[PDB]
């Protein structure tokens, strides 16, 4: 079935709160249609920054990722479970992968901080806000359900699967 949800930016606390309704005044709203067993697809749809509040671009991106992580965390964890052993069979490989993604993410964040004037890095910043949001959202959902939240490394690893395929045999 379909789960609706809506995120609200609380500008003062600088936090998002989520509710399980579709509310068009919300800061990111939409649904997760859990149809994977029915059609072979889940369907996710997010409309963000179209509500009452007028929001900076970075917070629109954060809210969209927050909403997506909140709705799909259970499946984020299953997809990790399923693909982790397809790519990583030896702790030696895990070492190589952790080290690369850690250095890469640190390097990405430092450039975003440094190049605050640049249109290209500003858009890298939008993508990275969405990723922080996705991390923030999936955690919220985990805590609320009483599960151990996924780590940021696990989310980096999911988004990096393509880059990891050719990289790991190196």
């Amino acid at each position: 079935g379909v789960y609706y949800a809506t995120a609200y930016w609380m500008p003062t606390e600088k936090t998002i709160q989520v509710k399980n309704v579709l509310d068009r005044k919300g800061d990111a709203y939409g649904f997760y249609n859990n149809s994977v067993k029915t059609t072979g697809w889940g369907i996710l749809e997010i409309k963000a920054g179209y509500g009452s509040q007028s929001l900076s671009n970075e917070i629109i991106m954060f809210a969209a990722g927050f909403l997506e992580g909140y709705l799909t965390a259970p499946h984020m964890d299953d997809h990790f479970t399923n693909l982790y052993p397809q790519l990583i069979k030896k702790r030696s490989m895990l070492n190589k992968v952790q080290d690369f993604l850690t250095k890469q993410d640190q390097w990405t964040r430092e450039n975003i901080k440094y190049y605050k004037s640049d249109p290209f890095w500003r858009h890298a910043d939008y993508v990275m806000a969405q990723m922080d949001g996705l991390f923030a959202g999936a955690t919220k959902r985990a805590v609320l359900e009483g599960k151990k939240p996924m780590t940021l490394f696990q989310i980096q690893f999911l988004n990096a699967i393509g880059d990891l395929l050719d990289l790991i045999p190196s």
Binding site: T39, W41, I43, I60, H75, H79, W107, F120, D166, L167
Partner: protein
């Protein structure tokens, strides 16, 4: 992965499609529709529909319908040059980040390639087809800029405009680099010498099958059919191998079955895309009477969250909010 852009003989329509190949453990799918209200003079697109997965802020596949009127397809090349792969360092942006920045900032295929090229990581070394539907005028012309082909290896992205080829009828993509400098530097010429013509750009099995059959696409049904195509027992280009064709079924390999190969097809035309619509099927192909895939036959592979059996149909994906 297999991809194909096919224009009808009087430019009456244009079809584009991608069929992903990878481990069947990846078939926990999510089709995504995002619309973010971004207001920024250097943003061209903050609305996009695309095939995807849980936790992926990208398609991976790839198959994207962007609000800038670009469509992005991609198939993965290999790089067999070990010295070249030594140049990969973490001080660079990953492929998914460059795809996302480019698909957000670019309004045409040259600008997409230029933005995607910046801080190239040399990871996920792929060919992209950037199809700019703003350049397509049905029954009239495919204007300059309609098709750019972008190919990435470590240290180097090459791109060129390929509309003149596409005006002849089609652009195919099947995991072998098109640009000669790419193909050479990635080591394909030594693979062809060592392993024969399956590694060549012109005579790999899927090159031959698309060369033979693209002209058989007359409409949506026959575009679906070529992109779901296997026929391995009868197609002479398959050499009897169920992976040697457009939509691979490596689980059917008779001496080393494995749970991987082709597991989806997404397809649209220019009319569907202008409404962010596509037809998408999840699962290995059963076309032509092939057996339904069942996880029961590979029951030691984790496949948490997925159904047991894949016998779905194409459904219509479109945003509704």
């Amino acid at each position: 992965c297999s991809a194909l852009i096919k224009v009808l003989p009087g430019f009456e329509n244009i079809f584009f499609a991608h069929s992903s190949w990878y481990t069947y453990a990846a078939m926990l799918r999510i089709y995504k529709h995002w619309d973010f209200n971004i207001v920024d003079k250097d943003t061209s697109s903050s609305r996009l529909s695309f095939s995807s997965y849980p936790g992926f802020l990208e398609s991976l596949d790839d198959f994207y319908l962007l609000s800038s009127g670009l469509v992005l397809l991609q198939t993965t090349n290999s790089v067999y040059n070990k010295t070249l792969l030594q140049h990969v360092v973490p001080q660079s942006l990953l492929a998914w980040q460059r795809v996302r920045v480019a698909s957000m900032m670019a309004n045409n295929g040259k600008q997409w390639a230029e933005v995607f090229s910046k801080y190239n990581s040399g990871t996920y070394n792929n060919q992209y087809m950037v199809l700019d539907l703003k350049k397509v005028n049905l029954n009239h012309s495919l204007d300059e800029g309609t098709l750019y082909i972008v190919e990435q290896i470590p240290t180097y992205v090459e791109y060129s405009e390929q509309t003149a080829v596409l005006r002849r009828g089609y652009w195919p993509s099947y995991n072998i680099p098109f640009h000669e400098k790419v193909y050479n530097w990635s080591g394909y010429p030594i693979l062809v010498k060592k392993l024969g013509l399956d590694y060549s750009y012109d005579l790999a099995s899927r090159a031959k099958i698309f060369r033979r059959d693209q002209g058989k696409v007359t409409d949506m049904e026959s575009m679906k059919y070529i992109m779901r195509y296997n026929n391995y027992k009868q197609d002479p280009y398959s050499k009897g191998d169920p992976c040697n064709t457009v939509c691979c079924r490596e689980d059917l390999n008779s001496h080393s079955p494995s749970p991987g190969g082709c597991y989806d097809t997404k397809v649209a035309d220019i009319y569907l895309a202008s409404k962010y619509k596509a037809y998408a099927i999840s699962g290995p192909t059963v076309q032509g009477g092939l057996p339904v895939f069942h996880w029961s036959r590979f029951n030691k592979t984790l496949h948490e969250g997925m159904p047991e059996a894949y016998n779905f149909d194409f459904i219509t994906m479109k945003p509704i909010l």
